[PDB]
Amino acid sequence: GQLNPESADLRALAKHLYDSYIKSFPLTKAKARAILTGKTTDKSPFVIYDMNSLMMGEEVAIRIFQGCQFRSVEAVQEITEYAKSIPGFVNLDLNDQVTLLKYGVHEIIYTMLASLMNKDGVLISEGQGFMTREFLKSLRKPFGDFMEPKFEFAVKFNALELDDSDLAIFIAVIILSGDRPGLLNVKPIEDIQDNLLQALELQLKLNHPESSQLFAKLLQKMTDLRQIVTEHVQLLQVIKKTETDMSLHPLLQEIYKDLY
Amino acid sequence: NLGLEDIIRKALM
Ligand SMILES: *c1ccc([N+](=O)[O-])cc1C(=O)Nc1cncc(C#N)c1
C-alpha cells in the first residue's frame, strides 16, 4: 500500500464519516465501554441480576415489541441523519434511500446494541442500569430466549475490538448494501459501497496492526446480524403459538422495551 | 412495516 492521492481521499472520507457519526449518535461505544469497565467516575449503574434485585431497582410480548419499536424511533432518525452525510446517498433515487434504510436500520441497531453489552449483561435505562445476561436467559418462555442470540453475537463482535472510528465506516457499509430487495438502481449504490469498503479496509489496516484478516472477519459478522434480524419473524411465530402463561413483571416489561 | 417507512421518509425530508 502507498500514501497517494487515493489513500489520502479515503482517510478524508473516514474522518468525514467519524465526524458525522459523533454528531449523529450521542451514545457512542467509547461512552458505553467507559461505563462497563469502571473507567468512569460519574456513572455507576444499578445491577439487576435476580427477581429480588429487580424489585430493589424499582399480548405482553407484542406490547414489548410495540414499545421498543416506539423507543427506537430516535435511533432510526439518528441513523437516517447519518446516512444523509454519506457522500452520494442523498443523490440516489429516493425510493432506494428508503429501501436501504428500512433494511439497514435493524442491522445497525443490533451493531450498536453490542456496544452496550458484555458477556455478563447489558446497559439499560440510559446507562443507569445493568441487566444481567443470565437473569434474562432465566425468564419464562418465550422471554428467556429473546436476548441470548444477541449476547452470543455481541461477544463475538466485541472480540474484534472495534472503536467508534471503525464503526462509523462499518455502519455506512451496511447502509449502502446493493443486495436489498426492491432496489431500483443497484449500480450507483455499489459505487458508493465500493468507496466505503476501500475506506474501511484502509482504516482497519491503520488501526489494528495485530489483527489478521479483520476486514474479512468484520464483513462476516454481517451474516450474524442478518440472522438475528431474520429470526425476529420466527419469534413472532413462537409467541402466537405459546400456550403457556406469558405474564411478566411490569419492571421486566419496561426493561425489555429498552432492548431490541 | 409501513410505520417504519414513514419514519424514514419524514426523517429524510
Ligand atoms: C423490542 C424489545 C425487545 C426485543 N427482544 O427482546 O427481542 C425485541 C424488540 C423488537 O421489536 N425487535 C425488533 C423489531 N423490529 C425489527 C427487528 C429486527 N430485525 C427487531
Author numbering:
A (entry chain A): 202 to 259, 276 to 477
B (entry chain D): 2260 to 2272
Question: What do the authors say?
Answer:
Nuclear receptors (NRs) are ligand-regulated transcription factors that control gene expression in response to binding endogenous metabolites and synthetic ligands, including about 15% of FDA-approved drugs. Peroxisome proliferator-activated receptor gamma (PPARγ) is a lipid-sensing NR and target of antidiabetic drugs that function as pharmacological agonists. Inverse agonists stabilize an LBD conformation that promotes interaction with corepressor proteins over coactivators, leading to transcriptional repression of gene expression.
To determine the structural basis of improved inverse agonism, we solved crystal structures of PPARγ LBD bound to NCoR1 corepressor peptide and compounds 2 (SR33544), 3 (SR33068), 4 (SR32904), 5 (SR36706), and 11 (SR33486) with resolutions ranging from 1.42 to 2.22 Å. Overall, the repressive PPARγ LBD conformation in these structures is highly similar to crystal structures of PPARγ LBD bound to NCoR1 corepressor peptide and T007090724, GW9662, and ZINC5672437 (0.15 Å Cα rmsd). Helix 12 adopts a solvent-occluded conformation within the orthosteric ligand-binding pocket, which exposes a larger AF-2 surface that enables the binding of the NCoR1 CoRNR motif. All of the crystallized compounds contain a pyridyl nitrogen, which in T0070907 is at the fourth position, with additional R1 groups that interact with the aromatic triad residues (His323, His449, Tyr473) via pi-stacking interactions. Compound 2 contains a pyridyl nitrogen at the third position pointing towards the NCoR1 corepressor peptide bound at the AF-2 surface, and a cyano group at the fifth position that points towards helix 11 with no water-bridged interaction with the side chain of His323. Compared to T0070907, the substituted pyridyl R1 groups in compounds 2, 3, 5, and 11 afford more favorable ΔGbind values. This suggests that the improved compound functional efficacy may originate in part from additional aromatic ring polarity and polar compound modifications projecting towards helix 11 or the bound corepressor peptide.
